[PDB]
């Protein structure tokens, strides 16, 4: 996807989902016998994501003004946004779209929790 960004073009990458990636990384490490951390995860299962998600950028004019936009996906168990990985990634990103079965099954689709959901780039990233 970076090729597009690096040559005056614009890509949009979707990581569906990053939860499963994190599970894969924990497997490697445990089998490499690298010592585990919180929830049996590697000691830097934040850096994993933080380095990945910093690669989505908007380049300067001197670089051709190209862009990589990212939409990572994370999956929660019972809506627990307090959990290790969901928190890690909430911290990395520029905002979040929260989806809820409670709203979904009430007919509301997409099940976007309007209160919690923000796009910090905001009205600067939106048609006038």
């Amino acid at each position: 996807g970076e090729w597009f960004r690096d040559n005056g073009k614009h890509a949009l990458i979707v990581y569906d989902d990053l939860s499963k990636q994190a599970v894969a990384y924990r497997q490697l490490s445990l089998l490499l016998r690298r010592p585990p951390g919180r929830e049996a995860y590697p000691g830097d299962v934040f850096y994993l994501h933080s380095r990945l998600l910093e690669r989505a950028a908007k380049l300067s004019e001197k670089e051709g003004s190209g862009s990589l936009t990212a939409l990572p996906v994370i999956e929660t168990q019972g809506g627990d946004v307090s959990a290790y990985i969901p928190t890690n990634v909430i911290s990395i990103t520029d905002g979040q779209i929260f989806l809820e079965a409670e709203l979904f099954y009430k007919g509301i689709r997409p099940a976007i929790n309007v209160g919690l959901s923000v796009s910090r780039v905001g009205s600067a990233a939106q048609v006038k």
Binding site: R33, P35, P36, G37, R38, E39, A40, Q77, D80, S82
Partner: protein, 268 residues
């Protein structure tokens, strides 16, 4: 799943259980108070209605004014709902009545069903035991803004507190100035034809017998709130016991899991 989530759910339940177990007792604080104004009410009924009993006062058949009484305060079982029943039941045998609602819960119970009928509405009611001053002014506004004394029939609706354990939505008539005159045995009385005794006695009665309904409806409600909160805080108590088991398990599995996590972190 999370100890935090279970901690909050256990607190809001026990809190509910204080709220209801206190409203249960704030009711019993008010329970004796309720029987004072209840017998005193039924006592003036015996005193003030015995005239009309003796005059054989009945409805001139020559357009009704229906007055419903409850309260602004909810959480009292089916005080509001089954008075609304009996008022609808009555609104089938004469659909065209004007409705005056005293209390906010009977207002919206009836506003759901016959929103065209309600034509005046009294607020800030359930809070204390009922008074003549309230009655008389609501009465005064009934005469003024509603033209009560032009109605072929006037009806009061309230719940009559049969027991301490159950109540019964009842209905009572108010006879106007004309209706008092044309009663059969009205002549039996040497009312001085000078003052319009029929006008003043109507005005006095309208106020007086609204207060009797109010005092009675009030009492029955107190018992409904005593009984409803008796059930609520018992259910809540039952929830607490269950959740206290679920809290205690999650309490432990959260200690266990942290420890396994730590112990694993030194497997090397």
């Amino acid at each position: 799943a999370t100890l935090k989530e279970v901690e909050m759910r256990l607190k809001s339940i026990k809190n509910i259980e204080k709220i209801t177990k206190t409203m249960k007792i704030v009711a019993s604080t008010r329970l004796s108070k309720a029987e004072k104004a209840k017998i005193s009410a039924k006592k003036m009924d015996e005193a003030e209605q015995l005239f009309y009993k003796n005059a054989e006062t009945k409805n001139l058949d020559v357009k009704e004014l229906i007055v419903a009484i409850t309260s602004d305060k909810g959480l009292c079982g089916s005080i509001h709902s089954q008075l609304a029943k009996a008022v609808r039941r009555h609104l089938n045998d004469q659909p065209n009545a004007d409705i005056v609602t005293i209390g906010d819960k009977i207002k919206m119970q009836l506003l759901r069903t016959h929103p065209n009928n309600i034509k005046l509405s009294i607020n800030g009611i359930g809070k204390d035991a009922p008074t003549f001053q309230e009655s008389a002014l609501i009465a005064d506004k009934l005469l003024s803004v509603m033209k009560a004394g032009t109605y072929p029939k006037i009806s009061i609706f309230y719940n009559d507190p049969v027991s301490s354990l159950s109540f019964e939505p009842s209905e009572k008539p108010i006879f106007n100035a004309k209706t008092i005159e044309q009663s059969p045995s009205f002549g039996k009385f040497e009312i001085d034809t000078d003052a319009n005794v029929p006008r003043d006695l109507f005005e006095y009665t309208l106020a007086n017998q609204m207060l009797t309904a109010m005092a009675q409806g009030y009492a029955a409600e107190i018992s409904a709130r005593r009984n409803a909160m008796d059930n609520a805080s018992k259910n809540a108590g039952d929830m607490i016991n269950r959740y206290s088991i679920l809290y205690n398990r999650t309490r432990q599995a959260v200690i266990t899991n942290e420890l396994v996590d730590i112990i694993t972190g030194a497997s090397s």
